[PDB]
Ligand binder design. Structure first.
Ligand SMILES: *[C@@H](CO)[C@@H](O)[C@H](O)[C@H](O)COP(=O)(O)O
Length: 320
C-alpha cells in the first residue's frame, strides 16, 4: 500500500536532483543536488526571473570596484549559492553545489573555488555542514577533495564512470561519491542505436553502481555511495538499498504515485575487510584510458557543464 518512494526512504537516503526548490518539498527528500546544467535550467525559468536580477543588483552594488569579468564570476557564484539556500530552506539535510567546471584540471584553483562557495554560504548565515562541494572526479579534482576533506570541507565527487575513479575517491577520504547510471546507459544505447532501454540486468549504468557499491562495502570504505543520473524509475528501483540515490522530480513523482512492494537489492555485510594498495596517479590514468566510455563521458561532462556555465555568464552579461 505504501508508495515506492516511502519504501525507498527506509532503505536508501533519498536525494532530490534539481535547482528548482519549489518541486522539492512535496517529495520530502533528505538532501538535494544541483549541477551547472540544473542551475542554468532554473535560471531560465520565468518564475525565477526576479531572483536573478536581484542577485545581479546585490552583488553589483556590494562590489562597485570589481572589473567587469570579476563581477560576472562573483554574480555566477552568488546565483549558485542563492538556489542552494532556497533548497536548504525546504529540506533538513545538505545541498550539493558544483565548482566551475573550468577548474577541473587544476587542484589549486578547484580548492580556491570550493572555499569561495563555502564563504558565500557562510556570509548568508548557512552552516557549512549543510553544504557539499561537487567536484568532477578527474585526478586533479580527487586531489583537491583530498585537501578539502583534511580541512573539514565535505565533497561530492561527481562524473564517476569507472571503479578506479571510485576507489581513488574513497582513498582520498571523500564524504560522498556520485557514480552515474544514466549517462552510461546513454552510451550503451548510442553504440548500437538502441531505442528502448536495455533490460535492468543488462543496463551498464545500473551495473556500474552495483560494482562500485560492492567494491566499497568489501573494502570498508565509509564514503557514501550515491547513485546519480537516471533515465527511468526501474533504474532507481534496481538500486534500492544503495546508501543514497539522487533523483529528478520527474522520477520522484513516478515513485510517489506507484504502490507496488519494493525489494531491497543492495545490502551491507560483515565480511572480512580487504585492504588493497592505493591507486597511484599513473595507475588511475591507465585504467581510465582503458575504459573508452569513462574517458569520453568524464571529458564530455566537463565540456558540457562548461558550456552551461558560459551560457549563464552570458545571461549575466546580457542583464548587467
Ligand atoms: C550531481 C551528482 O550528485 C547530479 O546533479 C548530477 O550532475 C546529475 O544527476 C546528472 O544527471 P544527468 O546525467 O541527467 O545530467
Amino acid at each position: 500500500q505504501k508508495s515506492v518512494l516511502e519504501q525507498l526512504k527506509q532503505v536508501t537516503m533519498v536525494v532530490a536532483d534539481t535547482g528548482d526548490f519549489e518541486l522539492i518539498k512535496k517529495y520530502k527528500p533528505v538532501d538535494a543536488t544541483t549541477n551547472p546544467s540544473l542551475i542554468l535550467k532554473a535560471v531560465k525559468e520565468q518564475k525565477y526571473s526576479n531572483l536573478v536580477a536581484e542577485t545581479i543588483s546585490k552583488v553589483k552594488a556590494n562590489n562597485p570596484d570589481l572589473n567587469s569579468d570579476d563581477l560576472v564570476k562573483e554574480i555566477a557564484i552568488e546565483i549558485l549559492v542563492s538556489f542552494g539556500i532556497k533548497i536548504l530552506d525546504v529540506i533538513e539535510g545538505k545541498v550539493s553545489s558544483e565548482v566551475d567546471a573550468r577548474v577541473s584540471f587544476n587542484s589549486a584553483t578547484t580548492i580556491d573555488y570550493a572555499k569561495r562557495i563555502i564563504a558565500r554560504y557562510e556570509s548568508n548565515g548557512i552552516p557549512k555542514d549543510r553544504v557539499l562541494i561537487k567536484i568532477a572526479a578527474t585526478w586533479e579534482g580527487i586531489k583537491a577533495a583530498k585537501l578539502l576533506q583534511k580541512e573539514g570541507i565535505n565533497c561530492n565527487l561527481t562524473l564517476i564512470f569507472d571503479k578506479a575513479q571510485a576507489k581513488a575517491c574513497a582513498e582520498a577520504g571523500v564524504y560522498l561519491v556520485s557514480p552515474f547510471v544514466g549517462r552510461i546507459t546513454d552510451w550503451q544505447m548510442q553504440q548500437n542505436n538502441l531505442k528502448t532501454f536495455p533490460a535492468i540486468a543488462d543496463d551498464d549504468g545500473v551495473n556500474s553502481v552495483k560494482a562500485i557499491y560492492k567494491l566499497y562495502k568489501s573494502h570498508g570504505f565509509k564514503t557514501i555511495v550515491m547513485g546519480a543520473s537516471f533515465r527511468n524509475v526501474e533504474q532507481v528501483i534496481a538500486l534500492a538499498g544503495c546508501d543514497a540515490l539522487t533523483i529528478s522530480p520527474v522520477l520522484l513523482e513516478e515513485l510517489k504515485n506507484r504502490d507496488e512492494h519494493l525489494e531491497v537489492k543492495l545490502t551491507k555485510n560483515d565480511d572480512v575487510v580487504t585492504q588493497s594498495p592505493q591507486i597511484s596517479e599513473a595507475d588511475f590514468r591507465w585504467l581510465m584510458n582503458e575504459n573508452a566510455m569513462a574517458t569520453h563521458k568524464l571529458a564530455e561532462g566537463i565540456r558540457l557543464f562548461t558550456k552551461d556555465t558560459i551560457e549563464l555568464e552570458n545571461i549575466i552579461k546580457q542583464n548587467l
